[PDB]
Design a protein around this ligand. Structure first.
Ligand code: CHL
Ligand code: CLA
Ligand code: CLA
Ligand code: CLA
Ligand code: CLA
Ligand code: CLA
Ligand code: CLA
Ligand SMILES: CCCCCCCCCCCCCCCC(=O)OC[C@H](COP(=O)(O)OC[C@@H](O)CO)OC(=O)CCCCCCCCCCCCCCC
Ligand SMILES: CC(/C=C/C=C(C)/C=C/[C@@]12O[C@]1(C)C[C@@H](O)CC2(C)C)=C\C=C\C=C(C)\C=C\C=C(C)\C=C\[C@@]12O[C@]1(C)C[C@@H](O)CC2(C)C
Ligand SMILES: CC1=C[C@H](O)CC(C)(C)[C@H]1/C=C/C(C)=C/C=C/C(C)=C/C=C/C=C(C)/C=C/C=C(C)/C=C/C1=C(C)C[C@H](O)CC1(C)C
Ligand SMILES: CC1=C(/C=C/C(C)=C\C=C\C(C)=C\C=C\C=C(C)\C=C/C=C(C)/C=C/C2=C(C)CCCC2(C)C)C(C)(C)CCC1
Ligand code: SF4
Ligand SMILES: [Ca+2]
Lengths: 77, 42, 73, 743, 221, 208
């Protein structure tokens, strides 16, 4: 650890991971319009259809939110 | 091989070879006999 | 070509500078630089940001022709 | 719907058999010539693939391999430039003393007298001064020795070989399937994130590890041979740390989001480095990093094999409204079917881009010692303007080829296109009107000023001293840019460009680099000239596209093709109704527009920008600030621009610039030569040729390939080609002699 | 049939018959639909095998002289890291009986013969046991399977005489190779960031696992 | 004149081109660019390879043997590379014109033989002399085959002609070898040989 940046990074990260994980985020098996269900064809041991492609996606999104927020927190106060 | 010699006989290629030879010749002649408004040997 | 020839030979004769034609008429840059370019000097200044003179009617007309000619294209 | 690698093996056999059969691609041309017209058609149809075959897969394979051929040629050309930089350049001497030495990368042989073109460029070097700009690039890249240029030339040659090989490979061995090409989401995802993103990131890497430090030692006056090699900055981080201390951290601030600590070599200062007159390399590396992130993000927008992301067809179809009907419905099918459509959009955007580049490179000189090298700057701006304009006229040509060849409402319909076609008369009539209004109220103002000045009424002119037409809007804009740093861009230290912000004149070697560019009635009038010329070009080309199918004069025009001379003397006469002839006509107007643009650039930059500066700071501009009072009149353009600034090129004989005098006259010659073709017609020429042919048969020397006058269309194409070459090369010689002598 | 990150594409062709099959091709590289050069699934299997074997040899020989140099009978003049061997001159060099370039020409000659003939068994099986090669031809006729030619030279002891043991040993060779490739990759990245050699790096992690070069991310030669 | 289908090829496993059936001496199936693809050009190039081979064997002798002996305490002969600059009993140009005349005669008659086989076998002065060869490139006769080793059975002539062509290929490579060596190194070829024999691991291409 060694910073409050860790808290915001695991915050935005784990929050987006949780979003894409169960529901209320366009997962690989959930296509959005303006969240319809669809098949990726890519199997996953996780029973809820949360795949590896969506794992990488939600992680990177949690890092975009997290780095943007921490740089918005440090460059303000 | 026969087809390649045929291609090398085609108008533009034969023209580049021919005029390239002619250019090298005229260049070298003007290199050993530069300037010259006249035929000096009479 | 005829009139360029006549006018340049005479305009050099009238200036006592016949040599300028004799040496400069053997290459085309000589015609472009020492006839047209050189003798446009007073013409194109017939009017300018600093005033006018009697040559303005010839400056104007000079462009008029340039325009009409180009319109023809 | 599962994106994947798809090719076919050995579609076309590698053989010289069809090398020996001219016109093999065409069933008619392959029969060989009965007349000389054959010889021209063979060359006009060589790259018209969709006329050779109707199979989209074959066409796509030809296109792909052809692109490989192009890239091979480009790499061979870059290999040439770097090799000449290593072997026939004064680049090291210039690298020592840039503000004095003139860059020269070509040396001529002493054969016929031409060695005079090897002029004194400094550094004990005789040669031709180059205006391409490679010295400023190589310096900005940290390149010091000729050896590094050798290595780059060898790598470039190798890549030429690789590209050529891949062309042969993907046409003759592994040729992609049609579905492979049509995977548009995959292609856009890989060009956004893979090509542009990883390219920009890689370049940021080279800059932070090579360009920034080596340029620090160059700017600190260190001798280039004494500068550490670029990899010594990668090995011993103490060299960089001495130059840039942040490198002592070990990229830990990057992962810990302490990125502000990198403000050392990643900066948002803006403006120009006053030593080099180019943009801050810290700002540039930071820039390439940001761009890299943006494109790497943009490359995940489109769905491929994992369900996340967008289908482009979905996006198109959702966009429709009460004015446009079902619009955008059908465009995915058109843009994945017609090559000419894609080439049309890409030519439009790539040319427009090239023009934007032309502006941004002068107003924000990106390389060191580039701004003060006026020959290189004028050459670059003019060059990229020409490329842009040509590319845009091409975009019109291929929009027209789409309309004639690939448009089919019974199969691939689009509502927007149909509606446009359904009020083409309104569109073209209104564009026509705007063009007339702009002609009068831009050029007619010039005629007003010439007439008032000739009559001795300068107070009745349109001038900053008489009837002022101030560009109030643009002035307000550049003021807002001047005020931006610290206010609406608190991170920006200085103005975005020195053309905006008042003061902060930048001078290098006594010559100015950039200062605030004034704007007045002269600039107003010229800008409306640019508006006018662009609108007329758009009129000709757009009219060509929208009436390519049909018109009230010719209802079946699309059946006559994209490129045809006419439909005869009837209906009053129908010459030049083809969309091709609209491209022909639009080329002249692109020439007109771009010509006035580059004249405006040279005139304005020499009058109000470029010049020398005193030790006490008194600036003398190359021309005496005479733009404001002399450009507002056509006579002023004839006299104070053309007649004045042509003295160098007509006085170049006997110097190393005499080649520009020769090209001046020769380009005049080919331009006048074009008028023979543009003003006449092939019937006269064919009759004359009948008499000449008689003379040959008299002596048993008439050829079997019967001589024919050029086609009507070829007459036009020859004509416009020589017109453009002559005019453009004339301005070329004029510009280069002028700015090399007085710059 | 344990499956790892399979897809409908992958299971469409990955049949389980290929040694080491876990049905894993998320990019569909072994998809048999489009097949040209080097995207043939057979070629990718033979390639995984060859890369795997070479990677076994390299994974061993890269860390061996360093370890033996720690405590062993090897002279410390010759006991180096894999990257300081003279492979990468800026990382380090050693003066052998040759100039390292003559060594390279030599090795490209020997590997020239071995690899060229190997390929000829791939392109025309059994063609390397026909033309006169000063004998040796018989073992160069191959088994009809390029990755597994066997014969007297390459399989003298004939392990896996039954298909079951040969298939298990093939699964073993595949997983061994997949492990060794990741190994030599690890040598690359470790020696890149750490710079002390792979085994010395591991030891930096042994007495102090709290070292953990991940968070450090520092690099020196 | 004997097809040889299973002959050892240059590229084991590869298929020989159809215009190389093994009948020619020295046929290892090597013509990847199809330079002898048509029969006419293969005929011509067979004569070419033969003449190049013989000239290159004489040249390999003239370089390597005198350089080797003069390297010892036997001869004083100068370096083959610089032997042209030497001053002989007359100027080299007139020697060269002599050479062009006589060699021009020989090459001219060989030329007439290639273009019109057999038409050139008679002495234009003493007709009873004549030449025995029936194959182009192997003229025979008392002058060119006095020991008669050239007129023999097939398979023997194929063995010997194969020997000639392989020796000649080696000699071509060797002559150009001493050339590029003397340009690259600064000595004669025998010094390259000895310098390499002393330290073959180092004294190579890469000692410079
Ligand atoms: C197969 C024939 C043949 C070959 C391969 C060579 C090759 C050579 N000759 Mg000879 N020569 C040949 C025939 C003849 N030369 C000469 C007369 C000369 C002269 C006068 C010279 C050479 C020289 C040379 C050398 C030129 C250096 C060079 O080109 O470097 C790349 C070179 C190694 C030159 C030399 O000695 O260079 C040092 C030289 O000056 N030759 C005659 C006339 C009798 C020849 C007749 O066939
Ligand atoms: C609640 C959390 C939070 C907070 C407090 C902030 C706070 C801030 N952010 Mg941040 N941001 C966040 C979350 C947050 N951000 C997240 C999660 C992301 C990732 C998605 C970002 C990504 C982001 C970027 C990329 C940037 C900021 C920037 C900023 C700063 C100034 C932006 C501004 O208002 O100027 C006003 C801006 C404008 C008026 C721009 C209009 C001009 C446009 C670009 C031209 C039109 C072009 C057209 C769209 C095409 C500011 C202190 C900026 C910065 O770093 O400051 C230096 C900046 O560039 N943020
Ligand atoms: C990150 C992957 C990637 C990259 C970097 C590129 C890069 C490029 N593509 Mg490609 N393409 C890709 C994936 C990619 N493509 C995909 C997924 C598709 C859809 C299936 C396409 C289909 C496509 C078509 C149809 C065409 C291109 C073209 C081009 C060239 C455009 C001109 C240019 O910018 O020159 C800049 C030059 C360089 C950056 C030099 C570097 C180029 C290196 C050598 C290639 C690196 C990427 C390459 C694909 C790696 C594969 C090699 C391997 C299989 C042996 C360019 C080099 C055009 C082309 O083929 O031009 C010949 C073109 O017609 N692309
Ligand atoms: C200098 C030569 C010249 C001139 C004057 C023009 C003029 C014009 N062209 Mg043309 N063109 C030219 C060269 C020229 N062209 C050439 C060489 C080509 C071959 C490539 C073309 C091909 C071409 C095409 C394909 C098109 C045009 C179009 C136009 C019109 C543009 C609209 C406009 O500006 O209206 C205003 C008029 C002017 C700016 C001319 C000057 C007006 C003066 C200053 C006003 C004086 C009025 C005064 C009261 C006169 C009364 C006096 C009394 C005694 C009668 C315009 C009238 C476009 C068009 O049709 O229009 C939309 C069109 O599509 N041109
Ligand atoms: C009217 C046009 C305009 C333009 C073109 C810009 C342009 C810019 N501003 Mg900005 N800004 C403006 C108005 C404008 N501003 C005004 C009127 C104010 C109040 C006085 C601000 C206050 C402001 C602040 C506080 C900052 C900027 C910053 C920036 C730069 C980074 C953009 C950014 O922050 O990302 C986007 C920011 C967002 C909040 C996301 C909005 C998405 C947009 C629309 C895209 C950028 C070049 C940043 C800077 O200084 O960079 C060095 C920064 O910190 N501006
Ligand atoms: C194909 C894999 C491979 C490759 C690329 C190399 C390459 C090399 N080895 Mg290595 N090695 C390998 C496998 C490999 N080895 C294996 C599997 C082992 C375990 C036994 C070793 C153990 C080893 C030792 C003990 C030494 C080398 C040495 C060397 C270097 C000098 C070569 C040499 O010893 O002369 C040829 C040796 C002959 C006996 C002949 C060289 C870079 C030597 C060296 O200089 O230290 C790195 C040396 O001391 N290697
Ligand atoms: C090792 C090289 C070699 C070989 C194997 C051959 C082989 C042959 N040659 Mg050839 N030849 C050679 C070199 C060679 N030649 C050279 C260098 C030249 C240029 C001078 C010629 C020019 C030539 C001509 C013009 C003719 C032949 C003929 C023949 C054939 C006649 C049989 C014979 O005498 O064989 C050669 C037997 C050998 C044992 C090899 C010769 C080794 C010599 C004696 C060593 C001398 C060392 C040197 C003087 C120092 C035969 C197939 C004749 C033919 O075909 O008859 C119909 C024919 O007319 N050859
Ligand atoms: C850009 C400004 C244009 C505003 C158009 C206003 C605008 O955007 O309206 C948009 C309007 C709304 O269309 P829809 O709502 O049907 O669009 C929905 C779909 O087409 C998109 O998903 O489209 C039209 O009105 C058809 C075009 C007729 C208008 C033709 C007039 C052309 C003159 C423009 C030139 C004068 C200004 C030039 C300055 C550069
Ligand atoms: C190497 C050479 C030719 C090489 C050709 C090659 C590899 C071509 C191969 C291929 O084309 C094929 C076949 C088939 C294609 O599908 C593929 C490729 C791969 C393209 C000729 C040498 C030919 C070499 C010759 C002929 C040398 C003759 C020497 C003479 C005459 C004597 C010279 C001297 O006299 C001097 C001048 C001075 C004296 O002091 C010394 C001496 C040496 C005595
Ligand atoms: C499959 C796939 C498909 C899907 O779809 C997707 C994905 C997943 C992406 C994919 C991919 C994956 C991966 C990762 C791969 C990788 C591989 C590798 C790594 C290899 C190596 C491999 C490797 C290798 C061979 C290596 C080898 C090595 C060696 C020999 C070494 C050597 C050496 C030694 C000893 C010592 C010295 O001193 C040095 C040297 C000289 C150096
Ligand atoms: C299975 C399991 C589980 C779960 C787990 C989890 C929850 C996971 C996850 C997750 C994760 C672990 C995530 C993370 C991630 C990351 C990522 C995905 C990355 C990213 C990246 C990138 C690419 C970045 C980029 C960037 C940005 C953002 C911007 C700027 C620049 C940079 C570069 C920085 C449990 C426990 C239940 C049980 C057991 C096992
Ligand atoms: S003059 Fe020529 S272009 Fe005009 S209608 Fe007649 S044939 Fe057609
Ligand atoms: Ca495939």
């Amino acid at each position: 650890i060694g910073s409050p940046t860790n808290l915001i990074m695991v915050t935005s990260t784990s929050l987006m991971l949780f979003a894409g994980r169960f529901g209320l985020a366009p997962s690989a098996n959930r296509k959005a319009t303006a969240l319809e269900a669809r098949d990726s064809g890519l199997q996953t041991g996780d029973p809820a259809g949360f795949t590896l492609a969506d794992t990488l996606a939600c992680g990177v999104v949690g890092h975009i939110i997290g780095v943007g927020v921490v740089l918005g927190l440090k460059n303000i106060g | 091989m026969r087809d390649l010699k045929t291609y090398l006989s085609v108008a533009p290629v034969a023209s580049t070879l021919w005029f390239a030879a002619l250019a090298g010749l005229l260049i070298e002649i003007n290199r050993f006999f530069p300037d010259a408004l006249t035929f000096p040997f009479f | 070509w005829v009139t360029f020839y006549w006018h340049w030979k005479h305009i050099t004769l009238w200036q006592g500078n016949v040599s300028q034609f004799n040496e400069s008429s053997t290459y085309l840059m000589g015609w472009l630089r020492d006839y047209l370019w050189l003798n446009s000097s007073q013409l194109i200044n017939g009017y300018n940001p600093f005033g006018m003179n009697s040559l303005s009617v010839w400056a104007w007309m000079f462009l008029f022709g340039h325009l009409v000619w180009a319109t023809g294209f | 719907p599962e994106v994947k690698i798809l090719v076919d093996r050995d579609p076309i056999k590698t053989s010289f058999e069809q090398w020996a059969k001219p016109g093999h691609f065409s069933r008619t041309i392959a029969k060989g010539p009965d007349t000389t017209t054959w010889i021209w058609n063979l060359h006009a149809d060589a790259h018209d693939f969709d006329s050779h075959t109707s199979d989209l897969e074959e066409i796509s394979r030809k296109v792909f391999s052809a692109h490989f051929g192009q890239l091979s040629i480009i790499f061979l050309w870059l290999s040439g430039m770097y090799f000449h930089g290593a072997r026939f350049s004064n680049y090291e001497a210039w690298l020592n003393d840039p503000t004095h030495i003139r860059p020269s990368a070509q040396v001529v042989w002493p054969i016929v007298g031409q060695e005079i073109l090897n002029g004194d460029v400094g550094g004990g070097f005789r040669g031709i001064q180059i205006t391409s700009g490679f010295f400023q690039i190589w310096r900005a890249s940290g390149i010091t020795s000729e050896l590094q240029l050798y290595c780059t030339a060898i790598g470039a040659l190798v890549f030429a070989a690789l590209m050529l090989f891949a062309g042969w490979f993907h046409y003759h061995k592994a040729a992609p399937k049609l579905v492979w090409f049509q995977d548009v989401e995959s292609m856009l995802n890989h060009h956004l994130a893979g090509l542009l993103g990883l390219g920009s990131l890689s370049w940021a890497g080279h800059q932070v590890h090579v360009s920034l430090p080596i340029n620090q030692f160059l700017n600190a006056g260190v001798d280039p041979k004494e500068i550490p090699l670029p990899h010594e900055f990668i090995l011993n981080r103490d060299l960089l740390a001495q130059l840039y201390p942040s490198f002592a951290e070990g990229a830990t601030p990057f992962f810990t989001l302490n990125w502000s600590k990198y403000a050392d070599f990643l900066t948002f200062r803006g403006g120009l480095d006053p030593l080099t007159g180019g943009l801050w390399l810290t700002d540039i590396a930071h820039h390439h990093l940001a761009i890299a992130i943006l494109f790497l993000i943009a490359g995940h927008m489109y769905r491929t094999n994992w369900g996340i992301g967008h289908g482009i067809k979905d996006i198109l179809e959702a966009h429709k409204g009460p004015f446009t009907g079902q619009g955008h419905k059908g465009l995915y099918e058109i843009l994945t079917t017609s090559w000419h459509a894609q080439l049309s959009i890409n030519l439009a955007m790539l040319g427009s881009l090239t023009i934007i580049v032309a502006h941004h490179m002068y107003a924000m000189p990106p390389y060191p010692y580039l701004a003060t090298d006026y020959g290189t700057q004028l050459s670059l701006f003019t060059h990229h303007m020409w490329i842009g304009g040509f590319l845009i006229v091409g975009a019109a040509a291929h929009a027209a080829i789409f309309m004639v060849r690939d448009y089919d409402p019974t199969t691939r319909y689009n509502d927007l296109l149909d509606r446009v076609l359904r009020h083409r008369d309104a569109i073209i009539s209104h564009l026509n009107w705007v063009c007339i209004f702009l002609g009068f109220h831009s050029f007619g103002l010039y005629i007003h000023n010439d007439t008032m000045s000739a009559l001795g009424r300068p107070q009745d002119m349109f001038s900053d001293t008489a009837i002022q037409l101030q560009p109030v809007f643009a002035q307000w804009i550049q003021n807002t840019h001047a005020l931006a740093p610290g206010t609406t861009a608190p991170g920006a230290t200085t103005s975005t460009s020195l053309t905006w912000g008042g003061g902060d004149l930048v001078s290098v070697g006594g010559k100015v680099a950039l200062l605030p560019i004034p704007l007045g009635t002269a600039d107003f009038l010229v800008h409306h000239i640019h508006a006018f010329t662009i609108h007329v070009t758009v009129l000709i080309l757009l009219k060509g596209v929208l009436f390519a199918r049909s018109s009230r004069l010719i209802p079946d025009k699309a059946n006559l093709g994209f490129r045809f001379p006419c439909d005869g003397p009837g209906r009053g006469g129908t010459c030049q109704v083809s969309a091709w002839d609209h491209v022909f006509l639009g080329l002249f107007w692109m020439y007109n527009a771009i010509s006035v643009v580059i004249f405006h650039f040279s005139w304005k930059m020499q009058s109000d920008v470029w010049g020398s500066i005193n030790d006490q700071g008194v600036v003398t501009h190359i021309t005496g600030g005479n733009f404001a009072q002399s450009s507002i009149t056509i006579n002023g353009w004839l006299r104070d621009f053309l007649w004045a600034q042509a003295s160098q090129v007509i006085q170049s004989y006997g110097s190393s610039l005499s080649a520009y005098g020769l090209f001046f006259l020769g380009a005049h010659f080919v331009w006048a030569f074009s008028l023979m073709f543009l003003f006449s017609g092939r019937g006269y020429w064919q009759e004359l040729i009948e008499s000449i042919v008689w003379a040959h048969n008299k002596l048993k020397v008439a050829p079997a390939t019967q001589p024919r006058a050029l086609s009507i269309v070829q007459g036009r194409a020859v004509g416009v080609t020589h017109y453009l070459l002559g005019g453009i090369a004339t301005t070329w010689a004029f510009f280069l002699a002028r700015i090399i002598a007085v710059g | 049939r344990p499956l790892w990150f399979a897809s409908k594409q992958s299971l469409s062709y990955l049949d389980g018959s290929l040694p080491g099959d876990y049905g894993f091709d998320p990019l569909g590289l072994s998809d048999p639909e489009g097949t040209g050069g080097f995207i043939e699934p057979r070629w990718l299997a033979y390639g995984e095998v060859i890369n795997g074997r070479f990677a076994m040899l390299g994974a061993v020989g890269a860390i061996a002289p360093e370890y033996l140099g720690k405590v062993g009978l090897i002279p410390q003049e010759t006991a180096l890291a894999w990257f300081q061997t003279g492979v990468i001159p800026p990382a380090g060099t050693y003066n052998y009986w040759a100039d390292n370039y003559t060594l390279f020409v030599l090795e490209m000659a020997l590997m020239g013969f071995a690899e060229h003939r190997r390929f000829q068994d791939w392109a025309k099986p059994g063609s390397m046991g026909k033309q006169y090669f000063l004998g040796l031809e018989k073992g160069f006729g191959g088994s009809g399977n390029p990755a597994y030619p066997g014969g007297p030279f390459f399989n003298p002891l004939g392990f896996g005489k039954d298909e079951k043991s040969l298939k298990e040993l093939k699964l073993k060779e595949v997983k061994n190779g997949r492990l060794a490739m990741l190994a030599i990759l690890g040598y690359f990245i470790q020696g890149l960031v750490t710079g002390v050699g792979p085994y010395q790096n591991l030891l930096d992690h042994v007495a102090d696992p709290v070292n953990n070069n991940v968070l450090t991310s520092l690099k020196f030669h | 004149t004997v097809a040889e289908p299973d002959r050892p090829l240059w590229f084991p496993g590869s298929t020989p081109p159809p215009w190389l059936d093994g009948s020619l001496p020295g046929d290892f199936g090597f013509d990847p660019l199809g330079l002898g693809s048509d029969p006419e050009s293969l005929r011509w190039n067979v004569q070419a390879e033969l003449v190049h081979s013989r000239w290159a064997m004489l040249g390999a002798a003239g370089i390597f043997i005198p350089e080797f002996l003069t390297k010892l305490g036997i001869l004083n002969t100068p370096s083959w590379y610089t032997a042209g600059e030497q001053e002989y009993f007359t100027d080299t140009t007139t020697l060269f014109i002599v050479e062009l005349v006589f060699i021009g005669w020989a090459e001219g008659r060989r030329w007439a033989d290639i273009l019109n086989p057999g038409c050139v076998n008679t002495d234009p002065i003493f007709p009873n002399n004549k030449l025995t060869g029936t194959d182009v490139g192997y003229p025979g006769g008392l002058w060119f085959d006095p020991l008669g080793w050239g007129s023999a059975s097939p398979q023997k002539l194929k063995e010997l002609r194969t020997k000639e062509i392989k020796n000649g290929r080696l000699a071509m490579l060797a002559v150009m070898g001493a050339w590029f060596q003397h340009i690259y190194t600064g000595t004669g070829p025998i010094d390259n040989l000895f310098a390499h024999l002393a330290d073959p691991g180092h004294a190579t291409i890469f000692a410079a």
